[PDB]
Amino acid sequence: RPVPFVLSFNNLTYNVTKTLLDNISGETRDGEILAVLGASGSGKSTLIDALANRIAKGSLKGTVTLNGEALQSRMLKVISAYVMQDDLLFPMLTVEETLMFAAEFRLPRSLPKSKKKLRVQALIDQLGIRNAAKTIIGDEGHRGISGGERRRVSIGIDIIHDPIVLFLDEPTSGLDSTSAFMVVKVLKRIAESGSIIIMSIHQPSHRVLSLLDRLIFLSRGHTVFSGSPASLPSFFAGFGNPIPENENQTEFALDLIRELEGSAGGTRGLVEFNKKWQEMKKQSLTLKEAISASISRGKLVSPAFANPFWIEIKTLTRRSILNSRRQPELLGMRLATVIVTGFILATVFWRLDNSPKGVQERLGFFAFAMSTMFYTCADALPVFLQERYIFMRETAYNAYRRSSYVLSHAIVTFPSLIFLSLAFAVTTFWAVGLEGGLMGFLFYCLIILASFWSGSSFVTFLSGVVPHVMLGYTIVVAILAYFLLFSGFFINRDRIPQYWIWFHYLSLVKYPYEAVLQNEFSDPTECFVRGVQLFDNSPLGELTYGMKLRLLDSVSRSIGMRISSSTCLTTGADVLKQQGVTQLSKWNCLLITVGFGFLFRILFYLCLLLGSKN
Amino acid sequence: RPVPFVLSFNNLTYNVTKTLLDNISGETRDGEILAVLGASGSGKSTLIDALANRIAKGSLKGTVTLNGEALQSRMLKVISAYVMQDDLLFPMLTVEETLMFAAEFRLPRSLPKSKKKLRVQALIDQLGIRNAAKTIIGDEGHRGISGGERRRVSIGIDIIHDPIVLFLDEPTSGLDSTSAFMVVKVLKRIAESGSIIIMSIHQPSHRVLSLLDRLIFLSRGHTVFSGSPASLPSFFAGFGNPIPENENQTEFALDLIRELEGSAGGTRGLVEFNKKWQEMKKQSLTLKEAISASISRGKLVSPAFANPFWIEIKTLTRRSILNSRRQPELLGMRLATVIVTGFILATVFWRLDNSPKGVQERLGFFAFAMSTMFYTCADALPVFLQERYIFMRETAYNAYRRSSYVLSHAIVTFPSLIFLSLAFAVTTFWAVGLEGGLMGFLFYCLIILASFWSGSSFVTFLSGVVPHVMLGYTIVVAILAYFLLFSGFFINRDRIPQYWIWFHYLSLVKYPYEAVLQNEFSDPTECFVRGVQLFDNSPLGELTYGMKLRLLDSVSRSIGMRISSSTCLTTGADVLKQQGVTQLSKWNCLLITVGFGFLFRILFYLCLLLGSKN
Ligand SMILES: Nc1ncnc2c1ncn2[C@@H]1O[C@H](COP(=O)(O)OP(=O)(O)O)[C@@H](O)[C@H]1O
Ligand SMILES: Nc1ncnc2c1ncn2[C@@H]1O[C@H](COP(=O)(O)OP(=O)(O)O)[C@@H](O)[C@H]1O
Ligand code: VO4
């Protein structure tokens, strides 16, 4: 005993000149699986984008009406669901967990978790995925569910709130003949409890034609057949091309059209025959209370967001913990890239002396060290697009906010970055022989952690801007190399030209590099030229030890300073003056590294706003 | 009027303990499309790997026999074809071009090109791809042929020599119901001219069961049904589970097995019933001259390789030219990465002076310049795996040699690297103000070209070793950073520790870097300390210009040399002695850069030998 809903769309015209829809009529009751057949550019993903109100208002001339209140974009978020054309699921999540996260995101917080689990277990029985309810989804290399049980979990995510109107953009694409029948057979099970189901389909099997109660064929818009599948034999015989038996009728009715548009003819002879056939077959409670009559039976489980910003920030945290705990070779390869570089940098630069050449090796250690923190954060660019192609699916239903997505993904990566910062610091502080003691080691861990934080935020920012993972990881390798060229190591700040001293201050490597130099070269006790080391690698004065002091006493002719055999002519403060590291403190250079991390998480949030407009 | 061939395999047992095949019997005449049905781990890609002789000899107990001479792995290279399970095609090639390259690779050179084009045009009519014969194949973003016309080109490549025995590993996987019927319908057209076709199939449609004349069901080996599809209703009724009508017969016979293996029961009740059914149904010219009788009709178009090493080196050249000419945004992104870095490096290091700090900026220019040649060659790692996943397909047929593949792919990239070497050299020689004149510019182009050649060969070598494009481009970014740390720029050769002075000499960046330093700092006229530059950035001697000459005359107290106000205390030969660039000439450092390129193309060739063993 369902509640009857009648989705009637009378005339549709969408022009982008180039028209895409032209006077498509339709009428679909509950219990029916109206199918929109067509071509690969016919615009059948545009027709159901116009019934789901997913195009601009005012650019769609005509009415899409339910039984009652005109069906504008206020009811088509509580009672509607639009299933897109992919299976964008997290692969380390089981089928019961994937539908329970969608239940915790979109079902209201007034429901208990025992009632949200009762919705998931009733949905797993409905989709026919009870045998794979505890099997993970799986990508190409993790041995999960099949390709046609990955579609009913994709369908099951969008119907977790139990809609009474269901749009699907090609739910049988990519599947074989025996599992595309299983998808429409559970859509028939959905559309017998009261749902209106409107789907696109390229080439249906003969088994899925007694499930579909209505068909619509499109030809660059321009509906050429619109009726029951049983009336499809007695439509083209009147047109001029009768169909033979022992042949799929929708197969013959589709390849006939793709040779009929011609060059001198056209589909116009077939368009005007469609309105001929619809004219001759006619000789044969409010909406808001009908929606509430569905909830009395129970046909609608579900404010803009069902959860507060602090509830959906612990659910997105629990997803990202579970998706990385079950995928541990991601922080096994990023961990053994900072340990391998940490072991290499510690043994090459092992216990650097206070020579003038051992000072330039500190500048070369700290430039290679602080660039590892930015290059190992670029390895996470594969699983940053994968988490935001699923985010763009779940933003259409308002499962969570964009603020709760950016904040909960800055949170889950941070215990990973604390472990990467201690692994790189205990390998390279005591082995390179860095200065500071223990309070210089704690700052060394803090500036590695801020460089992991500023580097993860930049690669996160460079994932709302790049489409591809190979274009993005070529661009981020090139840009971080320019951040290293402008860090002040290859060319100093007072030597960079004036048309280029703006990307020096925009360098992400500069402020970690300038903070470890004055963590290391800030000590009045350590010395790098002890009086005799003036004339050591000079172009003169290659003496044994004698008569160098007479050269040092000869310096007192011109200045008056009494230079002895050990007088400490170069401290660490003179190294920083040679390199130009004088403008900011090491704590101010730590704030800019933390501040550049917060900047690129805000700019990532602003690129999710403009990506929502697309 | 075909020539009858009867492929009879009587008993097969393959053990890897873990038995994978157990006593599979079969008998397939010409004109029949024997199908091997099963599960997702049943080992039905192992049964046709044992009929194609693609497993180890002696590990397969039993006979796979044709009508005659026992069918060992000498006839299964001329008369056989094994179609694997993918569509590994170059996407910028048209359908007529993709089959003409396979005709130029595998048809004998005794045939004219007019007879090889007559084979391709007869094959395009046979596969039913005449409408898409001049359409390109296309990847996900280049708008090519469909997914089920990409399979008949994949099938059409392997049957270009017109085999009389055809094995296919799942030729209907990934397709929909209407194009998997089109694949078996052209296989029915192939297997009416005289071919024996043996294919694996997961779930066949009801239309493809009157084309298949024989079926074999497997259950972890262990053939459970082996007969005609019409005898499939009258097999399970005798077993104990009769099938209802209006139901696909192979659909019910497959999900019955996946619930029958149980935990306390097993498929053993179904295995021993298969030999029951085969016993009760039986109550109802040499091979070498039968093969030559097929060529009399014309059923075999096709030495180990059909072409010499110089003919298939111009065909692989013509493929790689056509695949890159029609994909020009590959050398549009690698070109605008050496021009953008070339413009950045030329304007930052614009006209470097002869200061002591402008010397260290030359070492920083040349380290960043010579590392661009290795990092921009790592962008080609996507299309290096794609060209060698297609190479592993075409090595199984001996379409070309491994030597002709390595040599023709070192050849086609070289005019691309000459243009990248002139684009980086004319941007950065005259703008940075490098020394040498015009004979120092020609060496500058040669060492950029050798660094592009040594860097392309290393990334080519690191594509037979890595499976994945993201693992490989993380590894090659990390290793080339270690080639740069050991180049002698970050730490000099005489300062690198003795447990690490073997990766310094294995550094790929070291020899380009050491060759441009003694192309630049090898001039007895240029000078970097002109007498007064002793005490200009010293910790003392900060005079105006006066009384420094008394300090310089004071050097003659202990040395005896008359140091004047302009005496050239540091030439370019003293810069190279400070950096340790003394062991090799710039022409010897150019030979090691060219020699490291030839080393990594030999090691790439040796990794294709060991990849053939897998
Ligand atoms: N989201 C979109 N934004 C912009 N243009 C679109 C969008 N979707 C489709 N189009 C365009 O609309 C036209 C009609 O195609 P469409 O009806 O979407 O095809 P199909 O029936 O294959 O799904 C195409 O030219 C396509 O480029
Ligand atoms: N080329 C191969 N090398 C090694 N093991 C293989 C190979 N192909 C299959 N196997 C193994 O053989 C077993 C049987 O699977 P198989 O018969 O290939 O399956 P399917 O019927 O799905 O093609 C599996 O455990 C698989 O790991
Ligand atoms: O171009 V459409 O594939 O979405 O049929």
Ligand code: VO4
């Ligand atoms: O594991 V097998 O897919 O090759 O059916």
